[PDB]
Structure formats: C-alpha cells, structure tokens
Design an enzyme around this catalytic site. Structure first.
Site, PDB file in Angstrom:
ATOM      1  N   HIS A 169       2.744   3.941   2.430  1.00 12.02           N
ATOM      2  CA  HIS A 169       2.801   2.989   4.057  1.00 12.02           C
ATOM      3  C   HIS A 169       2.875   1.423   3.908  1.00 12.02           C
ATOM      4  CE1 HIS A 169      -1.575   3.857   4.378  1.00 12.02           C
ATOM      5  NE2 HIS A 169      -1.558   2.455   4.816  1.00 12.02           N
ATOM      6  N   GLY A 213      -7.034  -3.552   5.692  1.00  7.14           N
ATOM      7  CA  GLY A 213      -6.891  -4.183   4.449  1.00  7.14           C
ATOM      8  C   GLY A 213      -7.440  -3.036   3.267  1.00  7.14           C
ATOM      9  N   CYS A 258      -6.887   0.073   2.160  1.00  7.32           N
ATOM     10  CA  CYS A 258      -6.142   1.062   1.925  1.00  7.32           C
ATOM     11  C   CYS A 258      -5.646   0.628   0.194  1.00  7.32           C
ATOM     12  CB  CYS A 258      -4.695   1.245   2.622  1.00  7.32           C
ATOM     13  SG  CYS A 258      -5.300   1.709   4.198  1.00  7.32           S
TER      14      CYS A 258
END
Ligand SMILES: *[C@](O)(C(N)=O)[C@H](C[C@@H]1CCNC1=O)NC(=O)[C@@H]1[C@@H]2[C@H](CN1C(=O)[C@@H](NC(=O)CC(C)(C)C)C(C)(C)C)C2(C)C
Ligand SMILES: *[C@](O)(C(N)=O)[C@H](C[C@@H]1CCNC1=O)NC(=O)[C@@H]1[C@@H]2[C@H](CN1C(=O)[C@@H](NC(=O)CC(C)(C)C)C(C)(C)C)C2(C)C
Lengths: 306, 306
Positions: free
Chosen positions: A41, A143, A145
C-alpha cells in the site's frame, strides 16, 4: 532476580531499516542483501485505500517512482515485484549491514520484538505476542507501516512480522515477510473486526513459573487437576485449551521448580475463579500471557546473542 | 494508537559492550573512546565482597591483570584508575563504534533503557525508572553487573546508570558513569534496605493523559481539586507530593487533551480512594508510574533517533 518484558537488542535490525517513498506516501522498508521489502500500500493514495486494485495501481509505477533512502543516501531501484501484500524492490547495492537472517511465519501464542520506525529511523523497541485472533497489541502511529517484528537466535535474525494496519480497539495486523497476512485481515480500509481475544494459557503458566523462580509463591495452592477438568474452566474464561504438547513444553520450568504442570493449572484455576484479591504477581494485578516458556527460561538463565 | 513500555533502540550501546575479567570474576564494561568503564568489584573474590578495602585490593592489580574482550578480540590495557565505585581501564584502541555520548546523573522519577548483558554480549533491552528510593526494578542475574542504562536524544547517548547489585525484594542499585551510587547504597555484601517505594505521581498523571489520547476515558470524573487537597490524598497512598513544576511539565499533555492538570488530579484522587472496580487502563489493572511526560509525548508523537 526480577522479571521484565524484555526485547531483543535491536542493532542488527536498525542497520536494515530504510525509508520508501512512492508519490505522496512514505513508510519503512527492510533492506536485506540487494532487496527492500515494504507494504504494497506504499503505491496507494488515501482515496485508493478504500478499495484498491493493487495489480492495476502497480502498472502506473516504474523502478524510478520508488525513492529508497538509507539514512542520508539514495539507493538505485533496478527492479520491483509484488509478492502477496509486500513489494520487493531490487536495489543495485547489497546492504553491507545485512545480518544472518530467516523469514519465519510464527504460530499464535509466539512472541517477538517490534522495532517501531518512522521515516526509516528507529523510534523504540518492545515485545509483542501474536494473539490467538492473529492481532498484536502494538504502539503504531501513521508512518510506522513497514516496521518489523523479529526474534534473535544467537547470530540469526528470524523476521516474522511486517506492520500494515490498525483495527478498532487499537490492535494491529500485518504480514509475514512473504506478504501473507496473519489471520483474515486484508490491506483495504473496509470494516474488519478481530475475533474473540482468547488468553494464551501455556504463556500464563510459564509466567506463574517465572513468579515462583522469583519467590512470588502466595498463589501456590493445595490442589491439583486434570487437563479435561482444567480445560472446562479455561473455556469459561476464554483461555486457549491446554494440550499435552503444551504440558511437554512447560517441562523445563516444571523440572526446575519441582511443581507439576497440573498442580500449576490448579493454582491458575483458583486465580481464575477467585481473582487476585488485590494482590500482585511480578508487580502485575492481571494474569500476563505475553511470555512464552522459552522467554521465561531465556530471561531466568541469561541466554545472550552475537 | 496503542501504548507500550518502549525501550530506545540499543544498537549504539551494543557496539560499546565488552567483557572484563580480573582473576575469577567476569562482568561487563562500557568501551567509549580509549576507556573501558566497569564496576570496581571486578577486583573482588566472593570472600572480599563481605568487607572490601578497594584501595588495598587494587594495589595487587596491574594493567595486565585486566582482560578486556570486545567480541572475539583482546584489548591491550595501558592504564587503570578507580573513580568512586567504577574502574576506568585505558586501552590502546579507541572504540571505532563510539557514538556521540554524555554522562548524566538522572533525577528520581526519570526513565531510561537497560541493555542487560552477560559476558559482554547483549541479552535484552527494557525500560526502567529511577524510583524515589533510588532503586530500579530490573531483570539482572549473576554476570549482568556493568550493564548500562541510557537515553537517546537524536544522535546523542546519555549514559545514566551502571548495574552493581541486587537488594532484598529483588530490586537493583547502581551508579552513574562517574561511579557515584544512586541513593545510599554501597558496593559491599552487607545488610542494606530500600526506603519506602513511593509512587511517581507526575508519571501516573502522564500515563492517564496517554490513556485519554488512546480513547480510554472511563476514569474522567466530574470533579476538580487543588494541589494542597490532592497532596493530602497522595501522602496517604505513598504518592510523591505534586508541585507547580510538575503541573508545568504536564502542560503539553494538558494542552493536547484540553484536560486541566487539576481535573486529572481529581480523577487520580477518585482512582486512589475507590480503586479500578476490576476495570483496566491501557490494559493495566494498576496505576503505572514508569512513563514520564516526555515518554508519553515521544510515544504519542513518534520522535525518532539517528
Ligand atoms: C501505515 O500505512 C503507515 N503509513 O504507517 C498505516 C499505519 C496505521 C495508522 C494508525 N495506526 C496504524 O498502525 N496503515 C494504514 O493506514 C492502513 C492502510 C489503509 C488503512 N489502514 C489502517 O490501518 C486503517 N484501518 C482500517 O482501514 C481497518 C478498520 C477500518 C477496520 C479500522 C486506519 C483507519 C488508518 C487505522 C490500509 C491499506 C489497510
Ligand atoms: C554483579 O557483580 C554481577 N557479576 O553480575 C552482581 C549482580 C547481582 C547478582 C544477582 N542479581 C544482581 O543484580 N552483583 C553483586 O553480586 C553485588 C556485589 C557484591 C554482592 N552483590 C549483590 O548484589 C548482593 N547483594 C547484597 O550484598 C546486598 C544485600 C545483602 C542487602 C541483599 C547479592 C546477595 C548477590 C544480591 C557487591 C560488591 C555489592
């Protein structure tokens, strides 16, 4: 003596964290040899998150659309591919800090250390369990991820988790390093709900052994039980059923303390039925289930990593 | 979202840990520039620990009696001196992994990360507080002496703790990196007792703000209080008196949440007088006091380190 939630030293993993940017989206990647691993993503806009077709979105992306930054220095991306829910970015430089490592898909009830990162920079390290419902109770902000979970076995880093998302009740979902989600979660901003959060019974028993080893013995009672009779009480309190394999795994702690596992189950049964009467065990007012038998032995015997 | 006991990434400190051996005794040292710092009781036998005269014991020690090992490689000791309760071993090689660093003597109520080491090898990392009675609640076994506590401020490591000893009730005592013990403890195997373990009130308040930020709001009540009226309740429950400086320090969390500090004190007062009625706050059944206001802001805003 003393017993604390203890993470693995994070230095070997700190040297693998980079920043990945694609369009407006920045998150963390993992740089091992000449490959950067990150959540797929990264290629999404906020709009895209609602119902993404990742194969379609990826068509509009070339090698040069991925900016990868190791500290202050840009890496050249010479290939990309999607594997399940991760992207693999082939870069022209092997990470010179690559440790000995493996990719492992952990079982529910197993623990690991999280190195929380923002913009490819480590913020902090903490221990987590893979819960029976395939969530973790982390600390993750926007942030984070691409932050990873790992275990160290002497020299070898076993990567088992990459962070992707947060669910209602502020628990967390992610993938193994082959990009397969733990549990039924998908990388879409759509209604998803965690199942029942069952307690990891074998880990609670391991922690009761840690308490005994530390001289916290008030809860040791005069009773024993059977697996079947204990499991009728576990079911009521949303505890995982205890199996003979679990009893085998508690062998080292049972042998060290001279307390039969079924005697410790009978102590646990009384704690579940009567509560702690405002007492504490290893400074906790609840039954802790995020220490594995291995975690207890490791902490109580001083196993080190190189 | 989520809120966890989070250690600093340990990589910068892992590259400073060495093994120091003198006669039969092995423990950990800290290698910064061309100096190794370690507990001075490295020079003791078990017999000596009962009533040591460190100046006298040190006379029988030369540079070559100290074996210092950085991983698999021996360092050459070209000088030694005793500073308070630490030895400083001058070695002929500057640690090439030396980070930017400072020595800081922390105040009671401040937190730091411990990198637990055995034989100069990191075992694990966890957060601790310096308690009001100048103890820490660590996890330390035989061989862990010389393990250090630290904070990271972007690039700079502030070393504040070196581990020396364990007290009855399995709490821990040690020194700053100038070798001065926190509190009244001495490096002798003699009867010593911790004073009252008072709760760090300002940290409990910081953690209640963390709970609100995470949507745990059940404990927010309809009352306010004064500093003087709140402090009459703290005294009874062995809480540290709250001062105006403490109220000032909680300013950022008070401003972010829109909850006046004295309104949060009134919520704390009701939790102290009524208990939690079997409810939890950030998954805890007790009031947590080992998060500083800074720890809460840092975790809730994602401050990183390079
Ligand atoms: C991650 O992309 C990053 N940049 O750090 C991000 C991390 C989140 C933010 C808050 N806490 C975290 O762990 N992850 C995401 O934003 C993922 C991403 C899209 C949405 N998403 C979420 O985590 C959503 N959650 C959901 O959509 C599930 C729901 C609706 C059941 C709660 C939230 C709303 C941002 C938390 C995708 C592709 C899943
Ligand atoms: C340290 O030397 C090492 N090699 O790791 C050691 C660490 C201890 C062992 C158990 N847990 C720890 O943190 N420290 C010591 O052995 C120090 C050392 C001599 C005794 N000592 C202790 O920590 C004693 N404690 C006491 O003597 C205080 C007392 C009597 C009030 C409990 C114990 C009995 C080993 C815990 C000296 C020089 C203080």
């Amino acid at each position: 003596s003393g017993f604390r939630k203890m993470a693995f030293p994070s230095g070997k993993v700190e040297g693998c964290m980079v920043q990945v940017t694609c369009g407006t989206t920045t998150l963390n990647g993992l740089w091992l040899d000449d490959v950067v691993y990150c959540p797929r993503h990264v290629i999404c806009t906020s709009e895209d998150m609602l119902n993404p077709n990742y194969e379609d979105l990826l068509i509009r992306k070339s090698n040069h659309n991925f900016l990868v930054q190791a500290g202050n220095v840009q890496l050249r991306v010479i290939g990309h591919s999607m594997q399940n829910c991760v992207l693999k970015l082939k870069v022209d430089t092997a990470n010179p800090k690559t440790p000995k490592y493996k990719f492992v898909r952990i079982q529910p009830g197993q623990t690991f250390s999280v190195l929380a990162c923002y913009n490819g920079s480590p913020s902090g390290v903490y221990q987590c369990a893979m819960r029976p419902n395939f969530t973790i109770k982390g600390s993750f902000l926007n942030g984070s991820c691409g932050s990873v979970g790992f275990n160290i076995d002497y020299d070898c880093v076993s990567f088992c988790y990459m962070h992707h998302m947060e669910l209602p009740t502020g628990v967390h979902a992610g993938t193994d390093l082959e990009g397969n989600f733990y549990g039924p979660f998908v990388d879409r901003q759509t209604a998803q709900a965690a199942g029942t959060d069952t307690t990891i019974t074998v880990n609670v028993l391991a922690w009761l052994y840690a308490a005994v080893i530390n001289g916290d013995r008030w809860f040791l009672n005069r009773f024993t039980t059977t697996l079947n009779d204990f499991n009728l009480v576990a079911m009521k309190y949303n505890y995982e059923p205890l199996t003979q394999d679990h009893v085998d795994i508690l062998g080292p702690l049972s042998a060290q303390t001279g307390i039969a596992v079924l005697d410790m189950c009978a102590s646990l049964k009384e704690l579940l039925q009567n509560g702690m009467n405002g007492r504490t065990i290893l400074g906790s007012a609840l039954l802790e289930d995020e220490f594995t038998p291995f975690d207890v032995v490791r902490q109580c015997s001083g196993v080190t990593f190189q």
